[PDB]
Amino acid sequence: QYSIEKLKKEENSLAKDYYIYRLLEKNKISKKDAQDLNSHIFRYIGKIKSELEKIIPLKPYINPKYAKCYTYTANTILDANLTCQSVRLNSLVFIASLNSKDRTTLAQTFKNQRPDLTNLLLAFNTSDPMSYIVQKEDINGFFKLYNYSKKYDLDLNTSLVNKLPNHIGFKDFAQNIIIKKENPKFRHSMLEINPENVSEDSAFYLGVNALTYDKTELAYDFFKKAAQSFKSQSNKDNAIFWMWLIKNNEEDLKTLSQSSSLNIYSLYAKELTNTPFPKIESLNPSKKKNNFNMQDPFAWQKINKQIRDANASQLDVLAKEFDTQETLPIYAYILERKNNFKKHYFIMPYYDNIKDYNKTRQALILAIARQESRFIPTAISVSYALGMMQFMPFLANHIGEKELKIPNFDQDFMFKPEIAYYFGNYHLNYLESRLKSPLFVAYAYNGGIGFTNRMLARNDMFKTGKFEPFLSMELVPYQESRIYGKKVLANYIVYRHLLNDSIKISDIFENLI
Ligand SMILES: CC(=O)N[C@H]1[C@H](OCC2=Nc3cccc[n+]3C(=O)C2)O[C@H](CO)[C@@H](O)[C@@H]1O
Numbered sequence: 001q002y003s004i005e006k007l008k009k010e011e012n013s014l015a016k017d018y019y020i021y022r023l024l025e026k027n028k029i030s031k032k033d034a035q036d037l038n039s040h041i042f043r044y045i046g047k048i049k050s051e052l053e054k055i056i057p058l059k060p061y062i063n064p065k066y067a068k069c070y071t072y073t074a075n076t077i078l079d080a081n082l083t084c085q086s087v088r089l090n091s092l093v094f095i096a097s098l099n100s101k102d103r104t105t106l107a108q109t110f111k112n113q114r115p116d117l118t119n120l121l122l123a124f125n126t127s128d129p130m131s132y133i134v135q136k137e138d139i140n141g142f143f144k145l146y147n148y149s150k151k152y153d154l155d156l157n158t159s160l161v162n163k164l165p166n167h168i169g170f171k172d173f174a175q176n177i178i179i180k181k182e183n184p185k186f187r188h189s190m191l192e193i194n195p196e197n198v199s200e201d202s203a204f205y206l207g208v209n210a211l212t213y214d215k216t217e218l219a220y221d222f223f224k225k226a227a228q229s230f231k232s233q234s235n236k237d238n239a240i241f242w243m244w245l246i247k248n249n250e251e252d253l254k255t256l257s258q259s260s261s262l263n264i265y266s267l268y269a270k271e272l273t274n275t276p277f278p279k280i281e282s283l284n285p286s287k288k289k290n291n292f293n294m295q296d297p298f299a300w301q302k303i304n305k306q307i308r309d310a311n312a313s314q315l316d317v318l319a320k321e322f323d324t325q326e327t328l329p330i331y332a333y334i335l336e337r338k339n340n341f342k343k344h345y346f347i348m349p350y351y352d353n354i355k356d357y358n359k360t361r362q363a364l365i366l367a368i369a370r371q372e373s374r375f376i377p378t379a380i381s382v383s384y385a386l387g388m389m390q391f392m393p394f395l396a397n398h399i400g401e402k403e404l405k406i407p408n409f410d411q412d413f414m415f416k417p418e419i420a421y422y423f424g425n426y427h428l429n430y431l432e433s434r435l436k437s438p439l440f441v442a443y444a445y446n447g448g449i450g451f452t453n454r455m456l457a458r459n460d461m462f463k464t465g466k467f468e469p470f471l472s473m474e475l476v477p478y479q480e481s482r483i484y485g486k487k488v489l490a491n492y493i494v495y496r497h498l499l500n501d502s503i504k505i506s507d508i509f510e511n512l513i
Contacts, residue, residue, distance in 0.1 A: 004033050012042035013301035014380045021384060024051040031055055043382065074098045078105065085109070089117050092124075092148040100125045116140055130154050143169040150182065156189035165198045174202055178209045179477050181460075188213065195221045199229035204239055208474045211246075211467055220246045233261035238486075241265040245467065262344050264490045268505050277497055280344050283332055287324045294326060295415060297378040307334055329375040336374075346494050349375045350388075350417035357425060359501040364438050365389075365424050367491035368445060371484060378415045387414035389424040399423050437511055439473075442488040447481035462512055469512035 069084035123129035130152035207222035227239035256269035372390035400409035476482035
């Protein structure tokens with residue numbers, strides 16, 4: 001392994017973070033090594049933060065200007081100057097902590113300048129603050145209360161619900177309560193939001209909301225508004241698909257069958273309309289090799305930043321440089337960006353390691369690897385998932401040390417295609433044998449089998465129903481996994497096709513119920 005001094009000479013990157021983390025967790029960083037260190041951390045969040053602050057806990061940070069203001073409590077707040085008073089009253093917990101006499105006083109003080117404060121102050125002098133804020137139609141206060149406690153739930157009138165989307169907090173709020181199935185009175189009130197007043201994801205989610213109460217008309221209008229406003233074509237297609245499912249206008253399905261975006265919805269539309277399968281590019285570079293060390297994590301991280309920080313002209317220079325068999329995953333990575341994501345790249349690198357698996361298992365492996373890494377051997381994620389199949393270190397060690405007992409096993413073996421594909425196959429077997437559907441497998445690869453089993457046990461998920469299974473696909477409670485499923489499923493269809501082992505996507509959907 002590389003020492004801390006040798007890491008310090010490399011550019012900040014997720015690779016460097018990973019390796020610093022690995023020293024940390026094996027307790028190989030002294031208090032003296034850890035001094036100048038958070039100048040060397042590319043992204044100072046998560047576990048590397050936790051770990052480095054067990055050595056050097058951070059004193060900061062409260063602004064030197066308001067330092068005075070954090071020396072008062074709910075007992076001494078009326079002794080605070082007027083700035084200090086207003087600063088501390090940013091916290092709804094602080095306000096809750098005050099007694100009701102002090103709230104009445106402070107509320108008189110602020111009714112002129114800060115009636116936002118006044119309203120919250122007076123709100124916490126009632127048994128139900130939300131109800132007070134709702135009656136005042138204080139939008140800022142509504143969201144402060146929502147962030148403070150998710151437990152307030154109350155019917156909102158048309159006037160008020162239509163003001164809510166104007167606030168930055170609305171999107172997360174709506175997605176939260178609709179996916180989690182919380183705040184039933186909020187959700188029911190959101191049926192009266194005018195579609196004119198929302199766009200993009202908010203409008204999409206309000207469409208899902210409307211379906212759950214069997215309000216198909218409002219749902220369509222919500223989905224329509226989502227389709228017209230969405231930035232990405234994939235999302236636009238998701239919304240058009242619903243537009244069609246609800247009303248069945250063939251204009252909508254045709255638009256969807258003709259989409260440039262390859263996704264489960266455009267694939268399904270093409271199947272229903274007898275539209276041919278989309279053009280999949282074919283990359284067979286003659287040249288066999290170049291310099292590039294495909295096993296070097298640091299080399300990838302630098303070439304990666306070059307590919308993001310590159311004008312459409314610098315890309316052509318990289319494309320030609322990496323036009324080899326050895327660097328085929330990079331070639332395709334560059335190409336994908338270069339042609340502005342209009343062409344469809346579905347490579348099959350390191351094929352010898354999977355050619356003996358049945359074709360259906362091959363497709364799943366490839367589908368997962370495409371989404372997880374675009375087949376970059378030394379790919380590292382923000383949570384330090386490793387290699388082409390993006391194994392979390394816990395699971396990689398459990399498999400390699402305990403289950404497959406590989407000799408001299410290190411987790412950096414996940415950077416090896418032969419290992420990635422083999423551990424991938426192993427883990428996929430465990431999941432397929434319990435879940436069957438490759439969609440369900442995909443949810444569990446990403447978010448674990450506990451989460452997936454909890455979801456399938458539910459009465460209202462992946463059961464029979466008017467809009468099933470598409471509705472349940474919209475209600476998978478982890479956003480990361482909800483998206484991952486859709487994408488891996490589309491990769492699966494495509495890879496089964498390229499492997500001369502086609503399946504109708506409608507068959508996939510029937511076996512979800
Ligand atoms: C390298 C990386 O961060 N991969 C993550 C992957 O990132 C999606 C990627 N998507 C794309 C898309 C186009 C080009 C390149 N990439 C990537 O390199 C990675 O997202 C998954 C969840 O959906 C994560 O589990 C996975 O670790």
